[PDB]
Design an enzyme around this catalytic site. Structure first.
Site, PDB file in Angstrom:
ATOM      1  N   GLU A  36       0.824  -1.196   0.000  1.00 44.46           N
ATOM      2  CA  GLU A  36       0.000   0.000   0.000  1.00 44.46           C
ATOM      3  C   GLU A  36       0.864   1.255   0.000  1.00 44.46           C
ATOM      4  O   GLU A  36       1.910   1.317   0.655  1.00 44.46           O
ATOM      5  CB  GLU A  36      -0.928   0.000   1.212  1.00 44.46           C
ATOM      6  CG  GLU A  36      -2.154   0.867   1.075  1.00 44.46           C
ATOM      7  CD  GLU A  36      -3.297   0.378   1.942  1.00 44.46           C
ATOM      8  OE1 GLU A  36      -3.649   1.079   2.912  1.00 44.46           O
ATOM      9  OE2 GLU A  36      -3.843  -0.710   1.651  1.00 44.46           O
ATOM     10  N   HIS A  98      -4.568   7.051  -0.231  1.00 43.48           N
ATOM     11  CA  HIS A  98      -3.846   5.789  -0.140  1.00 43.48           C
ATOM     12  C   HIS A  98      -4.407   4.846  -1.199  1.00 43.48           C
ATOM     13  O   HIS A  98      -5.391   5.157  -1.874  1.00 43.48           O
ATOM     14  CB  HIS A  98      -3.923   5.192   1.272  1.00 43.48           C
ATOM     15  CG  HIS A  98      -5.287   4.710   1.659  1.00 43.48           C
ATOM     16  ND1 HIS A  98      -6.227   5.529   2.245  1.00 43.48           N
ATOM     17  CD2 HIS A  98      -5.860   3.487   1.564  1.00 43.48           C
ATOM     18  CE1 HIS A  98      -7.326   4.834   2.484  1.00 43.48           C
ATOM     19  NE2 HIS A  98      -7.129   3.593   2.079  1.00 43.48           N
ATOM     20  N   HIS A 100      -5.551   0.788  -2.604  1.00 47.47           N
ATOM     21  CA  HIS A 100      -6.242  -0.436  -2.229  1.00 47.47           C
ATOM     22  C   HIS A 100      -5.948  -1.515  -3.262  1.00 47.47           C
ATOM     23  O   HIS A 100      -6.015  -1.252  -4.471  1.00 47.47           O
ATOM     24  CB  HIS A 100      -7.761  -0.220  -2.138  1.00 47.47           C
ATOM     25  CG  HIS A 100      -8.239   0.174  -0.775  1.00 47.47           C
ATOM     26  ND1 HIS A 100      -9.540  -0.019  -0.361  1.00 47.47           N
ATOM     27  CD2 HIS A 100      -7.598   0.761   0.262  1.00 47.47           C
ATOM     28  CE1 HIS A 100      -9.679   0.428   0.875  1.00 47.47           C
ATOM     29  NE2 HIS A 100      -8.515   0.908   1.276  1.00 47.47           N
TER      30      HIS A 100
END
Ligand SMILES: [Zn+2]
EC number: 3.4.-.-
Lengths: 152, 26
Positions: A36, A98, A100
């Site tokens: 990630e 961020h 996924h």
């Protein structure tokens, strides 16, 4: 790879400029070994509209795992610090992003809880999730969060 | 054009850089 434009229920625009989209999509978890990535969303307030001009990028300072991320690096604050200086206070911190490891992402319970506890949104803020095929983007006002719609 | 309405409003200035939260978990 051009700009993306998102709208809320009041037609307040949230603009992601083309260089930001390319930087975001460069951290797509395309491989099963991909960890990630994430950082800060930085940009401009223009009335009720928002324009994302820059992001902070992951560094080895951060804890990066396949389904987890800990944005800890001091360079994230420095980017916010320096862009504030170069822009004379016009390019400001606007939220977090961020990635996924899924094609079309949606925030999890950990993502929502960390956002309500993390980002202070006295003024509007933006949260972003970089999926493998598309992007989830939301707006925060105080403690309330709502998904944006892609402009037709 | 799609982003034009956002650029038709003059930007806002803020007094000091924002203090980002330390350790953003997700
Ligand atoms: Zn997550």
């Amino acid at each position: 790879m051009n700009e993306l434009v998102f709208i809320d229920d009041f037609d307040n625009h949230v603009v992601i400029m083309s260089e930001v989209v390319m930087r975001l999509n460069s951290y797509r978890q395309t491989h099963y070994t991909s960890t990630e990535s994430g950082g800060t969303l930085i940009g401009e307030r223009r009335g009720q509209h928002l324009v994302i001009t820059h992001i902070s990028e992951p560094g080895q300072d951060d804890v990066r795992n396949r389904t987890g991320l800990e944005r800890k690096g001091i360079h994230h604050q420095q980017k916010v610090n320096d862009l504030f200086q170069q822009s004379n206070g016009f390019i400001v911190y606007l939220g977090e992003w961020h990635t996924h490891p899924e094609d079309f992402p949606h925030p999890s319970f950990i993502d929502i809880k960390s956002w309500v506890m993390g980002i202070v949104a006295t003024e509007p803020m933006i949260m972003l999730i970089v999926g493998r095929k598309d992007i989830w983007i939301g707006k925060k006002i105080k403690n309330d969060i709502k998904k944006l719609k892609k402009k037709m | 054009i799609a982003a034009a309405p956002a650029f038709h409003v003059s930007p806002s200035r803020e007094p000091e850089p924002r203090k980002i939260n330390k350790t953003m978990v997700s």
